[PDB]
Amino acid sequence: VFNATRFASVYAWNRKRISNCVADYSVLYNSASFSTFKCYGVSPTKLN
Amino acid sequence: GAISSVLNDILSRLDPPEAEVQIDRLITGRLQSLQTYVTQQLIRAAEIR
């Protein structure tokens, strides 16, 4: 999702379905990457 | 009017200042609903007496 070379166009976009797995969201804070990171539905720190 | 009626949900999701906004709506309504209950019980208390 994040590290893909070229994403899908916003005119026609492919939605990535992710289920039945382990999601580690602490790596985002352990290593700063995103310039703009925000959450409307939840808090950015509560994803983990 | 709050995003969710469960306190644990808003606390595990929204930011600290954002949760207080939702907690205000939950406390406000629950306070009014309880005041309405006490009011009605006092009325019925006058009817039984």
Question: CA–CA separation, B17 vs B4, rounded Å?
Answer: 16
Q: Which residue of A has its CA nearest to B15?
A: A43
Residue B30 vs residues A37, B5, B22, B35, B44: alpha-carbon distances, Å: 35, 10, 12, 9, 21
Q: How many CB atoms lie within 10 A of CB B22?
A: 20
Q: CB distance from B12 to chain A under 8 Å?
A: yes
Q: Mention every residue, 6+ apart, whose C-beta is less than 8 A from residue B1.
A: B25, B29
3-class DSSP state for residue B8?
helix
Residue B21 vs residues A31, B18, B31, B35: alpha-carbon distances, Å: 31, 5, 16, 21
Q: Which residue of A has its CA nearest to B13?
A: A42
Residue pair B3/B22 in contact (Cβ under 8 Å)? The answer is yes
3-class DSSP state for residue A34?
coil
In angstroms, this model's resolution equals 3.9
Q: How many CB atoms lie within 10 A of CB A45?
A: 12
Residue pair B8/A37 in contact (Cβ under 8 Å)? The answer is no
Mutant choice from B9, B13, B18, B22 vs A, greatest count of A C-beta within 10 A: B13
